[PDB]
Amino acid sequence: AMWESKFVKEGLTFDDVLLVPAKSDVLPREVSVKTVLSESLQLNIPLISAGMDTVTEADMAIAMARQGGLGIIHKNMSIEQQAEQVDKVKRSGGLLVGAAVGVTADAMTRIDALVKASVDAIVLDTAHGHSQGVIDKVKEVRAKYPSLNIIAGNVATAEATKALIEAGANVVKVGIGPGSICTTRVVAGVGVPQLTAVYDCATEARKHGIPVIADGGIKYSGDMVKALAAGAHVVMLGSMFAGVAESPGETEIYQGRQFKVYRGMGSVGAMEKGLVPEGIEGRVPYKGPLADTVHQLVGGLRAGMGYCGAQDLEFLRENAQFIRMSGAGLLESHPHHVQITKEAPNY
Amino acid sequence: NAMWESKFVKEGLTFDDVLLVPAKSDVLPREVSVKTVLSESLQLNIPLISAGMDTVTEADMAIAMARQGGLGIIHKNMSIEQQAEQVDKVKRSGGLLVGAAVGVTADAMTRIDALVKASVDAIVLDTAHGHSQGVIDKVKEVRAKYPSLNIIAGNVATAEATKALIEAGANVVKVGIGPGSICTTRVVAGVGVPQLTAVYDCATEARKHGIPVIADGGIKYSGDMVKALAAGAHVVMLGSMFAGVAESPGETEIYQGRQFKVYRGMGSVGAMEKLVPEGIEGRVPYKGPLADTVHQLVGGLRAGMGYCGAQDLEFLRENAQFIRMSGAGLLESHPHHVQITKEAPNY
Amino acid sequence: NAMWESKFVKEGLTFDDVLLVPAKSDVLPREVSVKTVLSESLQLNIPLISAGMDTVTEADMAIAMARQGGLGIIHKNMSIEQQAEQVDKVKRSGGLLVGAAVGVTADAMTRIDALVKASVDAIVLDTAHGHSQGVIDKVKEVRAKYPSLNIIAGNVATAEATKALIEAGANVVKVGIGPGSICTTRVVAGVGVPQLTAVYDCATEARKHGIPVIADGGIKYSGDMVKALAAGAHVVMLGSMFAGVAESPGETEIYQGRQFKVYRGMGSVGAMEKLVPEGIEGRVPYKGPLADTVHQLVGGLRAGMGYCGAQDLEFLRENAQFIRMSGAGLLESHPHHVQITKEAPNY
Amino acid sequence: NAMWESKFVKEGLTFDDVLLVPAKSDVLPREVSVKTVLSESLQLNIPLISAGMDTVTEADMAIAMARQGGLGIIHKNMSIEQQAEQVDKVKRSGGLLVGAAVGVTADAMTRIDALVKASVDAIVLDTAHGHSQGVIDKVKEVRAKYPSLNIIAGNVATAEATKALIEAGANVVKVGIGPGSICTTRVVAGVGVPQLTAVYDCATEARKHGIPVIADGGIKYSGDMVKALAAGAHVVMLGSMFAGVAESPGETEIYQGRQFKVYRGMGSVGAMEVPEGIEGRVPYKGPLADTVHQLVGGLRAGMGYCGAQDLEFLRENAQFIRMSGAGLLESHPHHVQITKEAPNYS
Ligand SMILES: C/C(=N/O)c1cccc(C(C)(C)NC(=O)Nc2ccc(Cl)c(-c3nc(C(F)(F)F)cs3)c2)c1
Ligand SMILES: C/C(=N/O)c1cccc(C(C)(C)NC(=O)Nc2ccc(Cl)c(-c3nc(C(F)(F)F)cs3)c2)c1
Ligand SMILES: C/C(=N/O)c1cccc(C(C)(C)NC(=O)Nc2ccc(Cl)c(-c3nc(C(F)(F)F)cs3)c2)c1
Ligand SMILES: C/C(=N/O)c1cccc(C(C)(C)NC(=O)Nc2ccc(Cl)c(-c3nc(C(F)(F)F)cs3)c2)c1
Ligand SMILES: O=c1[nH]cnc2c1ncn2[C@@H]1O[C@H](COP(=O)(O)O)[C@@H](O)[C@H]1O
Ligand SMILES: O=c1[nH]cnc2c1ncn2[C@@H]1O[C@H](COP(=O)(O)O)[C@@H](O)[C@H]1O
Ligand SMILES: O=c1[nH]cnc2c1ncn2[C@@H]1O[C@H](COP(=O)(O)O)[C@@H](O)[C@H]1O
Ligand SMILES: O=c1[nH]cnc2c1ncn2[C@@H]1O[C@H](COP(=O)(O)O)[C@@H](O)[C@H]1O
Ligand SMILES: [K+]
Ligand SMILES: [K+]
Ligand SMILES: [K+]
Ligand SMILES: [K+]
Questions:
Q1: In terms of DSSP bridges, do strands B235-238 and B252-255 run parallel, antiparallel, or are they unpaired?
Q2: What are phi and psi of D178, to 5 degrees?
Q3: Rounded CA gap, C8 and C107, in Å?
Q4: Tally of structural domains, chain A
Q5: Is D157 in the pocket of ligand 3 (CB under 6 A)?
Q6: C295: exposed, middle or buried (C-beta count within 10 Å: 0-12, 13-18, 19+)?
Q7: CATH number at residue B40
Q8: 3-state secondary structure of A321
Q9: Is the dihedral of CA C21, C26, C30, C33 positive or negative?
Q10: Is B345 helix (H, G, I), strand (E, B) or coil?
C-alpha cells in the first residue's frame, strides 16, 4: 500500500483559499485579539517575532513585548551574551521573552544559563522536528525543568505533532519550507503547504489541549488571519518584522532607498555566525518603527474577525469557513487592471 | 465539531475560470431585448448601473447614464444637502432615474428623508459587510418608514446573507465581497468569495423570493458582464470601466504623454480623509464620452446573447451554460503571439 | 429547473493542457502518409488550410499553398467580381485546389454563382455563430441548388451544432469559437469552448455521419497541430503562422530595424472599414517564403505520428492517447533555465 | 472505439507539482548512504550520470565524474575510433568506470565492437523514441552478440515501452521524453509525459523484473533529483547542471558581460551539423567538485527529512503531497530582494 499511495496526498497554501463571510454581531473595533499559550505565557496579540540574527534581539523583543506580543532571542551568539540580553529585556518591567536553543551537545548548558535569567519560554527549533535527537532533547529538558514553557519545531505532520507532545513540549511550532528566505523545498524537495500543515497539526494538538504556532509564509495581514482561522493560536513572523527599526539587521542602501538585511538561519552567512545551505541572503524595505506595522497587522485581523463574526480568536478557529480558489481568483483578490499610484500602509 | 471538519470543503469560481457555451440561436444580436426590471417602479432599458463612488458617479454621470437607459448612484461622500440637490438636478432633467448611496451611519435616516423628498428612485444601503446585524436592523427601520421605497442592500456573498436582507425589507440585493479592482479586502482581511460563485449562490436564494441581484465589482471586460448576467444577476454595477469617462467627477491629467483619470476606492485612505484601509488609489485611461463605452458594453452583451440564443435576459439566466477552464485556456481566450499595433475600443 | 443546476458542470481542455502519449511504433517519420480526404472531390496532400482573411490568403497565398499540397481560402472582403477573378487567377496559375469564403448575406447566392463559374473547389460559409438559424437555412439553400458542391460550414463548438449543419447539407464542418490569436470573442462576448474539447466533442458527432471537421484557430506551434489532428480533426486551419509569410497579401513594414507584416482579425475595426469589433489589429515577424514554414509544420507532424506509431492520420485520430497536465508541466515542455542563443525554425 | 473515449483520462505530474512529506527520522544527512547498484558489474557511489552530449561529457568530464563516484557517458558525435580513444583514455587513469552513447544506425554494431574492445562498462542506445520497433530490434541484436554487456536503452515514458526494452535484452531502462531543458519535442511534436509520472509508471514495470530506471532530463534543482529518486529511479542523468562546469567541453565566453558556456541539444540544428532542440548558454559554475557537492548534499538533506537510511528505503517509502501553482510560489523565496546567489539556488 506504500507504493500505490505515493502521490495521493494533496496540500493547500494561503493563496489557495479565502475566508467566507458569515453573520456578524461584533464590530471590528470590539473584538479581542488576546490568546493564551499556557497559564504562564499569555499574549495580548498573537504575534511572535522569529528568532533570527536579523529580526529579534534585545531591542526587538522589548518593543514586541510592549505591544502585547513576544520576542524570541536567536541562538547565534555566545551563551553569556544571550543570557544578558534576556535579562536586559526582563529588566524593562518584567516583559515576556523567549530564546531559541539548538539541539547541540552544549544545549543544556545554554538552557541552564537562560533559566537563571528567568526566560519565559525556550524554543527547541530545528529544521526537522520529527528527528529522534530532537525528541530525546525534549524529554531531557522537560525532566530538568518541569514548569518551563517548551516550544518545539519545526514540524508539518500530525504524527510529528503527537511525538513532540509526548516528549514534553506544551507548544508545537508548524512550518517546513514556507519562509520567504527558505529554500528547503527547492534544495531538499521536502515540504508541506502551510495551511494544510497548520490544519493537520492543530487537529492533533487540539485533542491534547496544545496550542500550535503558524511559523513562516505570512506576507500580508490577511495570511495571518487565514493561519489563525486554520487552527493556529499565534503566528510567527520574520520578513514582516525585518524591516522594522528595532531589528538587529544592518542598514544598506539600494536605489537611494533604505533597506534592512534579512537572511535565513540556513544561509551561508548565517551559518558562519552560528553542509549545504537551505536559505538565501536578502533585504526588505525599511518600514520604520514596530508600532506602525503592528497596528496594520492587528487592524487587518480585526477586520477579518468582524467579517466572520468572531468576537474572540477561539470562536474564529472553531467556526471560520474557507472557500477553495483557482489561480485566476488570486488575481481577482489583488488589485488588477488599475495603475496603483499610492501604496497603502497595508498594501 | 462539524464546523471544524468542513473548513476547506467549498469551491469557488471567478469570471476568468469559465466561458459561455454557444447554443441554438434564432435571434440576431440586434434583435435581442436588454431591458430588465428591478421593481415595478424601477425599470432599465440597459442592465448597467454606475457605482456610487466619489470618482465615478455624480450629477453629470447619473444624467448621461440615465439618458443611455442605465442608472446612476450618487455617492454619499458629500453633505446631505449637496446630495439632495444633485438628485433633484437629475430628476428635473426630463424625469430620469437616479439613485443615491446611504451608509448605515447615524445620518442615514435624515439623509434618506432629504433624498425621498427629492423624488429619489432607489437608495443603496451598501457597507463592507451586508450580513451585519446593524445593517439588517437599519433595513427594517427604513422599510417600516417607506413601504413602497426601492431599497438596495449589500454587499453580500452567501445565500444565507441574501435571505437575511430579503427578510429585512430589501427588494434588491447587491452581491460582491472583494472583487473590486481597487479593493484590498482579501489581502488585508483574507476574506472574500469568488464573484461568479457568489452571484450564483445569492441569486439562487433570491430567485425563489422573486428578488433581483446586482453583480457589483469584478468586471474588467464586456464579456465579464455577460457571464454575470448569465450567472443569475439582473443588472451589473461597474466602477473601473466608468472612471476614465469624461462624465466622471475626476479631472484629466497626463502621465507619460497619456491621458488618465484618478480612480480611488471608498476604503482607501484618500476617500476617508474627505481604521485600517481596504482600498487603494489608482489611475485609469481616459475613455472619452460615456456614450462610447456604453455602446461597447451593450454591443458586447448583444453579441453574447446572440451566441447563446437568448431572446430575453430571463432566458439567458435560466438557460445559459458555462464550461470550466484552466489557466492555459485563459491565455488562449485573450490575444496571444501577436504584437498589438492598434488599441481596440473594446480591448 | 435542471438547466440552472447544470450551469458549471462542463469542463474544457485547450492545447497547452495536454501532451500526446508515446505508443508502440513500427513506422519512421519519413515513411508516414500525411494525406487526408475531405470529399471525393477534395483531397489534400498535406492537412493545412490557410484561413480566409484579408491579411493571410489571396491569389499568391492560395497558389503557393496549393503547390505545397494544401488548400487556400480566398477571403470575402472584396466584391463578387474581385473574388471570382482571384479564384480564376489561382486555377490559371497552376493552383490545384482553391476555396472561397462566403458570408450569410442576402446576396450570398449571387456570390456563390460567380465562384462556381470560376471553378471554385469549395465554398466556406464561415460566420461567428454557425449554430444560427440563418446559417442553417443558407446551407440548405445552397445544397438544394448545388448538390455536388463542397460546402464548408462554421464556426461551431458543440456536437449539437455539428449535427445541425450536417443535416442541413454541409459535408465539412469548421470548428473554433474564440481561440484565434487575434480573436477577442471570448473577451468581448464571454463565449467560447476550449479548442481541444470542442474538436473532440464535434468530431464525436461528425464521426457517426462520416463527416470531417476542421480545427480552426488557436494553433501557435507545430505540436498544437498534431494535438488538433489527434483530437479528431481531419485538417487544421492556420492564420498567425501564415501572416508573416512573403506570399501573404500584406506588405512588409519595418519597426525598429526589423521586418513585419500586418495581421488583423476579420472582426477588427480596420477590416470592417474595407460597430462592435471582436478582433484586434497587430503585426507578426516576417518569416520569408511559405515553403519554409510549411516544411517545419509537416516535419513536426511526421515526428509526432512516429511517436504514436500512426502510419495514417486516420490511425492517429482513432488511437492516439492524451495525458493531462498542470501549468507547471507547460513550463517544463518549453525550453527552460537556459538562455536561447539563436532563433530556431521551430521555436 | 474504446480507444476514442479514453483519450483525455490520464493525468500527469511533474517535479514542481509535488513535495516530499517529512517523516520520522533517526539518521543525520552525514550518515545516510547515497550508493546505488545498476548491475552486478556496475555500482556507483553517487546516483549521478552526466548525459552523453557534445557540450556536456568528454574524457575530462568522465574522469572527474568517475573520480567523484559518478559516471560519464561519452557522446557519439565523433568518429568511432575517437570515441574508443576517449573510453580507453578514461580507463587509463585509475581504472575508472565509463560509458559511451551509441545511436541506432546500420553502422551501430561496428561502433559497439570498438567500444567493448576498449573495455567500456556500459553502452547507451539513446534515441528519440525508445518504444520504436527499430530500437527493440537493435537491443535484441546487441544482446545476442554481448551477453555480459550492460545495455542502457531509452528513452521511454510508458510502462509498455519499459516492458518491451526489458524483454528485448536491456538491463537498464532510460526514462524521459520531452523534459530536457534544451528540448522542444513537446512543442514541436506535441509528445511527452511529465517526468514524475513517467518515472513512476516506468519504475513500477521495471520493479517486477529487478531492472533499474534512469531519470533522464528535467532536473534543474537538487530537490528535483531527490524527487526523482523517491519516485522509483535508481540514478539521475543531468545535462544542464553539468554543462556550465569547467570539465565540460565548452570554452568560456563573455556575452552581456557574463561568463557562459555553450549548451546545445542533440536535436538542435547546430549539433546535427526538423530540429527538436535549441542552442543555448549556461553560466560558468567552476570545478565539477563544487556542483557535485551541492547536488549530493541536497540529497542527504532530503533523505534526512524522510528518514531514509539508504536510497532503497527512499524509493520504497517516501511519500509525496500534491500542490498548486500558488504553493509553488511559496516553495521558492518570495517577497524578498535577493542580494547573494546561493550555491544551490540561482
Ligand atoms: C466597501 C468597503 N469595502 O471594504 C469599505 C468602504 C469604506 C470603508 C471601508 C473600511 C476601510 C472602513 N472598512 C470597513 O468598514 N471594514 C469592515 C470590516 C468588517 C466589518 Cl464586520 C465592517 C462593518 N461595518 C459596519 C457598518 F458600520 F457599516 F455598519 C457593520 S460591520 C466593516 C470599507
Ligand atoms: C469570425 C468572427 N468571429 O467573431 C467575426 C468575423 C467578422 C465579423 C464579426 C463581427 C465583429 C461583425 N461579429 C459578429 O458578426 N458577431 C456575431 C455574434 C453573434 C451572432 Cl449570433 C452573430 C451572427 N451573424 C449571423 C449572420 F449575420 F452572419 F447571419 C447570424 S448570427 C454574429 C465577427
Ligand atoms: C534525443 C532526441 N530527442 O528528440 C533527438 C536527438 C537527436 C536528433 C533528434 C531528431 C531531431 C533527429 N529527431 C528525431 O529523431 N525524432 C524522432 C521522432 C519520432 C521517431 Cl518515431 C523517431 C525515431 N527514431 C528511430 C530510431 F531508429 F532512430 F531510433 C526510429 S523512429 C525520431 C532527436
Ligand atoms: C531551521 C532551519 N531550516 O532549514 C535551518 C537552520 C539552520 C541551519 C539549517 C541547515 C542549512 C544547516 N540545514 C539543516 O540543518 N538541515 C537538516 C536537514 C535534514 C535533517 Cl534530518 C536535519 C536534522 N538536524 C537535526 C539536529 F539534531 F541536528 F538538529 C536532527 S535532523 C537538518 C537549517
Ligand atoms: O534559512 C532558513 N532556512 C529554512 N527556513 C528558515 C530559515 N531561516 C528562517 N526560517 C524559517 O522561516 C520562518 C520565518 O520566515 P518568514 O516569516 O516567512 O520570512 C522562521 O521562523 C523559520 O521557521
Ligand atoms: O475601497 C474599497 N474597498 C473595497 N471595495 C470597494 C471599495 N470601494 C468600492 N468598492 C466596491 O468595489 C466596487 C468596484 O468594482 P470595480 O471597480 O468594477 O472593480 C464598488 O462598486 C464597491 O462595491
Ligand atoms: O476578428 C476576428 N474575431 C474572432 N475570430 C476571428 C477573427 N478573424 C478571424 N477569426 C477566426 O480566428 C482564426 C484565427 O486563426 P489563428 O490566428 O491561427 O489563431 C481564423 O482562422 C478565424 O477562424
Ligand atoms: O536535442 C535534444 N532533443 C530532445 N531531448 C534532448 C536533446 N538533447 C538532450 N536531450 C535530453 O535531455 C536530457 C538532459 O536534459 P537536461 O534536463 O537539461 O539535463 C538528455 O539526457 C536527453 O534525454
Ligand atoms: K480586489
Ligand atoms: K483569443
Ligand atoms: K522541454
Ligand atoms: K520558501
A1: unpaired
A2: 105, -5
A3: 41
A4: 1
A5: no
A6: middle
A7: 3.20.20.70
A8: coil
A9: negative
A10: coil
Give me the phi and psi of A41, to 5 degrees please.
Answer: -135, 105
Measured in degrees and rounded to the nearest 5, phi and psi for residue D290 equal -70, -45
User: Residues D327, A10: contact at Cβ < 8 Å?
Assistant: no
User: Which runs of consecutive H residues, i.e. helices, occur in B169-322?
Assistant: 185-188, 195-207, 222-230, 240-243, 269-273, 290-308, 313-319
Separation CA D98–CA D100 (nearest Å): 7
Whole-number Å distance between alpha carbons of C165 and C132:
10
In the block, cell 528535483 appears at: D224
CB A208 within 8 A of CB A187: no
Neighbours of chain C (3+ CB pairs under 8 A): B, D
Collapse the DSSP code of B76 into the 3-class scheme (helix H, G, I; strand E, B; otherwise coil) and give the result: coil
Can you say whether residue C256 is alpha, beta or left, with left for phi > 0 and alpha for psi between -120 and 50 degrees? left
Ligand 7 lined by C182 (C-beta under 6 Å): yes
Query: Cell numbers at residue D287, please?
Result: 570545478
Three-state secondary structure call for residue A36: strand
| Closest-lying ligand 6 atom to the alpha carbon of residue B268 | 1
- Compute how many other C-beta atoms are within 10 angstroms of the C-beta atom of residue B229: 26
Q: Which helix (H) or strand (E) holds A339?
A: strand A339-340
Choose among C272, C249, C250: nearest CA to C260. Answer: C250
Other beta carbons within 10 angstroms of residue C3's beta carbon come to 11
Q: Which three cell numbers stand for residue D261?
A: 558556456
What is the C-alpha end-to-end distance of chain A, expressed in Å?
A: 47
C-alpha cell read off for A256: 537611494
Helix axis angle, B59-67 to B290-308, nearest 10°? 40
Instruction: Judge: A181–D301 Cβ closer than 8 Å, yes or no.
Output: no
**Cell numbers for C117:** 463559374
Task: Tell me how far apart the alpha carbons of residues D345 and A183 are, in angstroms, rounded to a whole number.
Answer: 8
- Tell the residue nearest (CA) to atom 14 of ligand 4: A127
Beta strands (DSSP E) in chain B are 10-11, 18-20, 36-39, 42-44, 48-50, 71-74, 99-102, 122-126, 151-156, 172-175, 213-216, 235-238, 252-255, 258-264, 281-285, 322-324, 339-342
DSSP string, A87-142: HHHHTTTS--EEEEE-S-TTHHHHHHHHHHTT-SEEEEE-S-TTBHHHHHHHHHHH
- Relative orientation angle of helices D195-207 and D222-230, to the nearest 10 degrees: 30
Nearest CA to ligand 5 atom 13: A216
Q: Are A107 and A101 in contact (CB under 8 A)?
A: yes
Cα–Cα dist B145/B124, whole Å: 16
If one counts every other C-beta atom within 10 angstroms of the C-beta of residue C273, the result is 7
Query: Residue C326: phi, psi to the nearest 5?
Result: -95, -175
Separation of alpha carbons D120 and D123, rounded Å: 7
Phi-psi label, residue D169: left if phi above 0, alpha if psi -120 to 50, beta otherwise: left
Grid cell at residue C26: 513500427
Q: Cα dihedral angle (D49, A5, D311, D286), rounded to 10 degrees? A: 40
Structural domain for C108, as ranges: 1-347
Q: Is D176 helix (H, G, I), strand (E, B) or coil?
A: coil
Residues A329, B189: C-beta atoms closer than 8 Å:
no
Residues in B touching C181 (Cβ below 8 Å)? 335-338
Helix (H) or strand (E) run with residue D253 in it: strand D253-255
| Cis-peptide, bond into residue D155, ω within 30° of zero | yes
Residue numbers of B annotated as active site: 183
Cα of D70 to nearest chain A Cα, Å = 19
Q: Which three cell numbers stand for residue B126?
A: 451598501
Contact B12, A329 (CB under 8 A): yes
